[PDB]
From Swiss-Prot:
SUBUNIT field: Interacts with CIK1; the interaction is direct. Interacts with VIK1; the interaction is direct.
Record annotation: effect of changing G95E: Poisons nuclear fusion
Annotated binding of ATP, by residue: N2, R4, R8, E70, G93, S94, G95, K96, T97, F98, E157, K182, T281
Function comment: Minus end-directed microtubule (MT) motor involved in spindle midzone assembly, poleward transport of newly captured kinetochores along the lateral side of MTs, karyogamy (nuclear fusion) during mating, and with an essential function in meiosis I. Functions together with the accessory proteins CIK1 or VIK1. Drives the poleward transport of newly captured kinetochores along the lateral side of MTs, both during S-phase and during M-phase.
Gene: KAR3
Extra facts: KAR3 contains two globular domains separated by an alpha-helical coiled coil. The N-terminal portion of KAR3 contains a microtubule association domain distinct from the kinesin-like C-terminal domain. Present with 3250 molecules/cell in log phase SD medium.
UniProt protein name: Kinesin-like protein KAR3
GO CC term (a single one): spindle pole body
Induction: By alpha factor.
Keyword Kinase applies: no
């Protein structure tokens, strides 16, 4: 499958955070090989250096605008009929929401503005594009309509998916996404939030349809399941299973050949058609640069490495 992995280190919160007991070193992108590497070391044992390689590594100097310079090329492929998935993964506090939802800057608002710029540019070629979206969340494996039964309906014919009784909204201009985001708006830290965009183009005779799924995943922090109870226990179990399944599915899709467990989780089942075929997927792993989070950071980088496809690994 067409999969890529980016890592992003957010700036440290000053005076409140520090890197006194660990080191995260990011190397310059290697034009010759097409990948970027980094090394993580814990002060308790500096002899053990954990190295990782990804398609791109954004450091603390990389702003949301800098990040989209890479992401724009991916999301525009939806105008050609490609389905696109972008997953922001990382512990709570690592920067997933800032990356995906920062006002005007986030991958979501940026994606919408970029698509409309392209839509206007494609009119000269006789293309007429219509845009509609949905904004849902999956919590404890249940779908919730943030723009408000919800059953997943896979159309094996057109290889598309819809969800019953979920509000869908037209987007006639990039400025309208404001109403959507405003409507939709801790809990979100324990759920997967999914912004779905459908691009329907007609050239009065070519036709094209592509879907973008921009996901802000539930926090990946490791919670000792043996130490939680009640609602916390149930959510931990569901987040663990869901994230584990996602990793397994993406890893399998990146292999040269298999029984991909799409049905093992609500998120992967919902997105199966946007994860298969010639669909393009980008895993965005957010990490903190600080020492207090080094263990979770290593966990996140290990997840990122697992989802790296055999294009790189
Ligand atoms: N790239 C960034 N640049 C500046 N601040 C950031 C960046 N990423 C995260 N932050 C800040 O770090 C904190 C973590 O934010 P958030 O995105 O909500 O994390 P998460 O969604 O992973 O739990 C916030 O106060 C946010 O404003
Ligand atoms: N799976 C993907 N994830 C993230 N970005 C992608 C993906 N596929 C393509 N892109 C984006 O589109 C650009 C070029 O697309 P592609 O035809 O695959 O050429 P290249 O070989 O340079 O990646 C990339 O530089 C990247 O920014
Ligand atoms: Mg968040």
């Amino acid at each position: 499958g067409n999969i890529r992995v980016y890592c992003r280190i957010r700036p440290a919160l000053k005076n409140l955070e520090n890197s006194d007991t660990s080191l995260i070193n990011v190397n310059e992108f290697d034009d010759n090989s097409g990948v970027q590497s980094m090394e993580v070391t814990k002060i308790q044992n500096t002899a053990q250096v954990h190295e990782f390689k990804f398609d791109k590594i954004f450091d603390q100097q990389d702003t949301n605008v800098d990040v989209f310079k890479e992401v724009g090329q991916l999301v525009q492929s939806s105008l050609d009929g490609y389905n696109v998935c972008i997953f922001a993964y990382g512990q709570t506090g690592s920067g997933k929401t800032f990356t995906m939802l920062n006002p005007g800057d986030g991958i979501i608002p940026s994606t919408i503005s970029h698509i409309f710029n392209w839509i206007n540019k494609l009119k000269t070629k006789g293309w007429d594009y219509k845009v509609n979206c949905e904004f849902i969340e999956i919590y404890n494996e249940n779908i919730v309509d943030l723009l408000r039964k919800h059953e997943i309906r896979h159309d094996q014919e057109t290889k598309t998916t819809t969800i019953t009784n979920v509000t869908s909204c037209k987007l006639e201009s990039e400025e309208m996404v404001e109403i959507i985001l405003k409507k939709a708006n801790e809990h979100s830290s324990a759920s997967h939030s999914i912004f779905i965009i459908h691009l329907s183009g007609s050239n009065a005779g070519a036709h094209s349809y592509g879907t973008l799924n921009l996901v802000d995943l539930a926090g990946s922090e490791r919670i000792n399941v043996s130490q939680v109870v009640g609602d916390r226990l149930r959510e931990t179990q569901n987040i663990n299973k869901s994230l584990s399944c996602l990793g397994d599915v993406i890893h399998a899709l990146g292999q040269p050949d298999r029984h991909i467990p799409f049905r093992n989780s609500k998120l992967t089942y919902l997105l199966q058609y946007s994860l298969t075929g010639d669909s393009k997927t980008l895993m965005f792993v957010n990490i903190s640069p600080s020492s207090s989070h080094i263990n979770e950071t290593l966990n996140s980088l290990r997840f990122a490495s697992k989802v790296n496809s055999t294009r790189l690994v």
